[PDB]
Amino acid sequence: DEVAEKCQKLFLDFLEEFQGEIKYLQLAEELIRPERNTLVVSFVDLEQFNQQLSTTIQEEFYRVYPYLCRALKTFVKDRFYVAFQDLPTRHKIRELTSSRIGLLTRISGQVVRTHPVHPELVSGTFLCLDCQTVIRDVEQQFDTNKSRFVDFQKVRIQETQAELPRGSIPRSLEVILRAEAVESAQAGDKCDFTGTLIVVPYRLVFLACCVAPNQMTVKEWEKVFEMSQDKNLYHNLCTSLFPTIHGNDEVKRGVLLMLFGGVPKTTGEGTSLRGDINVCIVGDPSTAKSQFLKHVEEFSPRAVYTSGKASSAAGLTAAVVRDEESHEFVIEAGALMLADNGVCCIDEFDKMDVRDQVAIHEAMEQQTISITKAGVKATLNARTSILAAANPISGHYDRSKSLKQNINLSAPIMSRFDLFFILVDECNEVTDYAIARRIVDLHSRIEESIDRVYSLDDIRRYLLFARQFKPKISKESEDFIVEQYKHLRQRSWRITVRQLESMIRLSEAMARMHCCDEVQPKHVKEAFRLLNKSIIRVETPDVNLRLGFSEYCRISNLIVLHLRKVEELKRSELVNWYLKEIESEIDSEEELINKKRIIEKVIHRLTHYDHVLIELTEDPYLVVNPNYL
Amino acid sequence: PLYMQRLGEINVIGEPFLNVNCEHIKSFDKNLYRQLISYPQEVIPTFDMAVNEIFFDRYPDSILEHQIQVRPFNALKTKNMRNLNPEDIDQLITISGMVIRTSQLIPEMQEAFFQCQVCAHTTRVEMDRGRIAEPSVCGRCHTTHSMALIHNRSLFSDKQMIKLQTVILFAHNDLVDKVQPGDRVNVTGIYRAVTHIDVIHYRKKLFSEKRVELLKELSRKPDIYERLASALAPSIYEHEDIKKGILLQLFGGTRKDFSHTGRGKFRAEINILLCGDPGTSKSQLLQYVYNLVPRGQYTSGTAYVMKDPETRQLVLQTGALVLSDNGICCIDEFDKMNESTRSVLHEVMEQQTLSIAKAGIICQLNARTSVLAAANPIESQWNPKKTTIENIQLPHTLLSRFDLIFLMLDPQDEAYDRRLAHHLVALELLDMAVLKDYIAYAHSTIMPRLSEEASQALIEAYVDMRKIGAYPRQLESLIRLAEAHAKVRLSNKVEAIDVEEAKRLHREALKQ
Amino acid sequence: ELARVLRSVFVSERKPALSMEVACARMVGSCCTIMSPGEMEKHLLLLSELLPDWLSLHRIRTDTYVKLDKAADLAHITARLAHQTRAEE
Ligand SMILES: Nc1ncnc2c1ncn2[C@@H]1O[C@H](COP(=O)(O)OP(=O)(O)OP(O)(O)=S)[C@@H](O)[C@H]1O
Ligand SMILES: [Mg+2]
Ligand SMILES: [Zn+2]
């Protein structure tokens, strides 16, 4: 092949002239080392150095690869295998056709099975048994001492879930790894393999050479920075993540927190502390539960959805199946281990049998799954966050029975969920009006009735940037957590050390949300409410111009705390303090006059209806009723 | 001549494929059409040569990947799959059918690359008639038996084996993977026996203007709705509301995609539950619906995994529910069914999808079906009680998922028995045959959309309905019913009449 | 960067013209930033309008197909794009 010789000369040219320092000189010198025998070459450097050579290599990779190795050996000997990386085109397994044979392409998939290392003979020195003639350098078409052997590994891969078309069985492909590529891949991992599709006697097999697992653009980086400085980022994210769901914002906050997640810690004793959050949702049929599952599935690319009763114990964690060709026993992956470092959603968790939940037990807490079946002994990682949805024993939450009687869940299962929300459906006219108008507006105005503060891709980028930080816990947060847990545990769902660990994880998640390198007690105060609330209504009723019950309690708490602090005042002075404190939120004169109206009404109402404030004789003195805590 | 414009379009796109309608050939030349039918394998090369010569004469500077190939389609021989005879061997045939399974990519050699073992002299051999013309001497050194075949250097053609519902179909090259199992295709190809069919072309409006005019004339009648209700099941007496509900289910709702909203694809197909004594019009009505509706399914009280005997691989088989996708599935004796199946029904009733996680097999399936179920009360008699569960013992979830629930009670009224007996002893045609095509036209052409007046009406209806107890799912069902009634009038907009009729029917069902 | 990716895709596909759907899907599946198909379509339209000599669009039947000149120097195109961006500033 004359073009092969031309390609060899051009490859020598690239190796000898690419630069102001030649990148590959040090790598070639390191190739002299016996443990190093493959050279990694970037494809972008090849295409920028010259285009005809790049196209020829991309088109006739199998034709010129041994010539590339000859060029590499010649270049090294003047002072071996060739590997390529950074091909800019990604392909799908279903795209693999016979027209692409011999093309240098890279494929993305998930490793499901692995095979041990085997020696492969490339060139064999044969001794004739008739005339004792030594025949050397005999290539193989697919004396051991003087022959050449190369390490081999066989890899079986499976199609990714995202690329899998609905109703299609994920096809499997065999991958051959040699020399340094051997043992570089592990079962259960998702990898991108660079190489060619060869024809085995026919049969389809892909030969691979390499594996795959500050620099962001200025405007994306600046948009992330600017949005990281937003004071209302928490509420804006809560609204944007569920634009079409009315009310029930507590579940929104909880799912956002579990998306953020905490940090895992491994003790010096080798014990690992879970840095994830598990959430359970139990509610009457009316309240939307599956919608949250669908939203978190469509938003997070690493989310897996499954049904309750249709899933067996083997299908969730793993199963032991005898391999047809090997005549041995192997392990087929389950749903939980495929959701590694992701989120797994289970619908109708109640319908599942106890024989399945007992299998779930280990993955829930110990975060790993172990199998000791039929002479197969192994342990597998199950680093997952579980979001479960279920209904009470009866379709209707019967108040004639106690709370414990209404939930048919085992005590450890109840304990191992960090956040546990219970939804009760009530007949309220204003809630009915709001729900009806939202539903009809969505049905008639599909696109124009959506106002998202931030784009979903922007939220994903911010979440990716935020998750890699590991905030530190401060001493003030330390003693605040101590006293808060003291008060909390002193009061069915018993509160054990597991809840304390969940509280620490929630504080860490709040710290990661705000991009703060240290944890502050404000996060602890925020998480304390969410841990306390438990049973939660759809929406709180209005209070007479109307104001929310939570805001009313917030104002009352702030004013009582300030008065009690000052004890160790005057109406106008206290109003002036409040306007000084709320200055960070008001942006217009109309908001100021509205706030003045609200605070005057609240002070008068507390004075004359709730009796928590006592008037003492135009600027009367105000004192706190001594029985408010 | 449309063929010159076709050639120009091919020149613009560069795809060397010609689709030729056999009726044009028959009209132009009957003898040539007969020759094409009798000996397609000999006239197709001549057609290819002629079209290639014409194209090269018109545009000689064409850099074509391959020579232009002619693919005739829609031959007169639309013979049934069961009507094949030994007489039409090596003749063109057109068959419509359902695709069950498609094999993987099978490479077939078309050019053999041989290299000399001494001087590396290379040669190419065309694969002909299933035999390899392996060279025996070298072209340079003339050494005998020095040729080596390289599989990688050789040229491969993709071929696929397809099972059609049975006959075996062989797609080659471009035709491979163009058809997905579960679709109806018109396959045109040459009949050959070893029996098999070699695919040449795949084929995957139906009303004249007079039919559309007649449909419009009927729709302009304000009584068409009640007239069609009278037309449905003539042998069934005094169940006009049930026939109205059946017709509304047949029309169904309109499909909407919520991809921009981030929400899942909402169900837009209506399900109706029937409960009553056995021996009533349940079985007859279910059989009538199953026979009348195309792609209907009848079942009595899912997907499964099959071994491939060839590759030892576990393949999937589709149950009646999956096979009835975009169709109507009817079930008898709903109460007498196992709880395991009814638990599975919740997913198909709600999300229209189905997920399986067993033995490492994880898959999701589309299950766009409408369920018409018949159930028997547990007492086998309408015991005087309050809730339907007290007589039928069904969970709240399944009942809430049903859009319409109807109860068949045999009244203890003498006149009703007289009318029943007279109907039996005494036991229209212009309507159902036209109605099948009319329903097809309504499904294909029109889709209604909601209005502001209907918005206010539905909001008030919901706020009044909850006072009786009500879930938002019944509001969704009311929207679907309004869409169905709008489709009944062939009106592109939902108005007050649709909402009022839907609310009336729902309140009548609740009262009953 | 998107222009470079498009050039590489057309090198890989061995085809003179490609449809909007396949090209946009491949670019999204190969791009470093997650983007919607509509954004990719508007970016392709902007590239066509700014630089018509390199990139041409043809409306056939009910679809628009994309044809590109593979012999153009990428460095010169990058310089021209930088000049256009500076002018737009
Ligand atoms: N706050 C809400 N905002 C908008 N739509 C709602 C709201 N609450 C309920 N809905 C509607 O009610 C439907 C019920 O949602 P689901 O999540 O399926 O209910 P569910 O509680 O999960 O009941 P199951 O478990 O599926 S039987 C939703 O699809 C919405 O159409
Ligand atoms: Mg649900
Ligand atoms: Zn020779």
Residue numbers in the entry:
A (entry chain 6): 20 to 38, 42 to 101, 110 to 172, 194 to 252, 294 to 305, 327 to 604, 613 to 665, 713 to 736, ...
B (entry chain 4): 191 to 355, 369 to 397, 414 to 423, 439 to 535, 544 to 669, 680 to 721, 729 to 771
C (entry chain 8): 456 to 544
What text appears in the publication on this structure?
We solved the structure of a subcomplex of OCCM containing the ORC, CDT1 and MCM but lacking CDC6 to 4.1 Å resolution (hOC1M). Compared with the full hOCCM complex, the ORC and MCM are bridged by WH domains of MCM6 and MCM7 domains but not that of MCM3, which becomes too flexible to be seen in the absence of CDC6. Despite the weaker signal, the OCCM-like benzonase footprint observed when CDC6 is omitted support the latter scenario, as do the OCCM-like 2D class averages obtained by negative-stain electron microscopy. Although CDC6 is required for efficient double hexamer loading in standard conditions, we found that at lower salt concentrations, a hDH footprint is observed in the absence of CDC6 when ATP is used. Therefore, CDC6 is not essential for hDH assembly under all conditions.
Eukaryotic DNA replication begins with the loading of the MCM replicative DNA helicase as a head-to-head double hexamer at origins of DNA replication. Our current understanding of how the double hexamer is assembled by the origin recognition complex (ORC), CDC6 and CDT1 comes mostly from budding yeast. Here we characterize human double hexamer (hDH) loading using biochemical reconstitution and cryo-electron microscopy with purified proteins. Although both yeast and humans use the ORC, CDC6 and CDT1 to load an MCM double hexamer around double stranded DNA, our work shows that there are clear differences in how the two organisms accomplish this feat.
